[PDB]
Structure 1
């Protein structure tokens, strides 16, 4: 069995999807934002706008198959990233708020541009998925990407303990 998008159809490996929440009341899709002294928007964050599908995210399995297997690792990159970013792939860097989800200004190695994994959420007509962060075990997926709203309203994506993200993947019109 593989990952299913928010309409029942199999998630197409490499395709573009909007990562929206289970409950639309929780917010909108995932986009970018300029936090810190970033020269541009390099912080992956959720949209405060309940009607915003957000940026279409590209999901690329670790397998070169047509579909993405259930426990497969996946790279997640913005279809239309910001100019300043070297590559369009989400990545995980350390920070005070813990591991944070950000875009990089210089190229990224495979071991960094391939650290996420989707996990099904049991009882739901529609397939919902939590987002895991897998790290270097000299791989271990046992960290859940969640939200952390910073003092400026930014609902950043950062590994958290409570309230992990629960997403539905809606195919984005190419």
Structure 2
């Protein structure tokens, strides 16, 4: 099984909320949302530039009713408290000229569209660190080797998108009740 482990050494609970913090303190803070481009509201998933900030608590769920999450299972990431305008708390990946980007949606999407992430163990580390993989849809299946990284746009928003270098390396801190 080899279940995902959180920042404090305890197994990650399937469906539990966690702050997705960068391994390296300097990289910034937690995950949030921001209104960018032509969006009518905060639909762009970004990383806070402030270290002291833990971002939004994020629910991490697989497609099973298991208590924990085996390392190779696909996961969906949703905000515990999504911005009012999103139809559901779940993140999804949307194509574009710039490339695939993590966004929220104004409509409820099918599971196959939100269960597109996968955490990957970062080797050479004492605390459990994980890269965040994006899993596209080949035929009817899926495949993940594209990593999610950060792209700072013209206004300083550190948008989460698929990048080819400097992928996110997170630790999952358990959010409080």
Tell me the TM-score normalised to structure 1 length: 0.98
Deviation at 1:96, TM superposition (A): 2.1
Match for residue 27 of structure 1? 28
Q: Give the distance between the partners of 2:157 and 2:172, measured in 1 at CA.
A: 22
In the TM superposition, what whole-angstrom CA distance separates every residue of 1:57-107 from its partner, at most 9, and x where no partner exists?
000012210000010100000000011101110100012220000001011
What is the match of residue 118 of structure 2?
117
How far, CA to CA, are the matches of 2:40 and 2:71 in structure 1? 37
Instruction: Please state how far the C-alpha of 1:136 moved relative to its aligned partner.
Output: 0.9
Q: Give 3-state SS (helix, strand or coil) of 2:147's partner.
A: strand
- Structure 1 Cα separation of the partners of residues 44 and 87 of structure 2: 14
Alignment correspondent of 2:162: 159
Secondary structure of 2:75 counterpart:
strand
Separation (CA, whole Å) in 1 of partners of 2:133 and 2:7: 19
Unaligned 5+ segments in structure 1 are none
**3-state secondary structure, aligned to 1:73:** coil
Pairwise CA distance, 1:125: 1.1
Report matched runs for 1:11-26 at 5 Å.
11-26=12-27
For residue 135 of structure 1, report the CA deviation from its aligned partner: 1.1
Residue number in structure 1 paired with 2:109: 108
Matched, 1:67 2:76: no
Query: CA separation in 2, counterparts of 1:97 and 1:23?
Result: 26
**Residue in structure 2 matched with residue 86 of structure 1 by the alignment:** 87
1:111 CA drift (Å): 1.0
Measured in 1, the distance between the counterparts of 2:161 and 2:98 equals 7
For structure 2, list consecutive stretches of 5 or more residues without a partner in the other structure.
none
- Segments of 4+ moved more than 4 angstroms: none
TM-score, length basis structure 2: 0.97
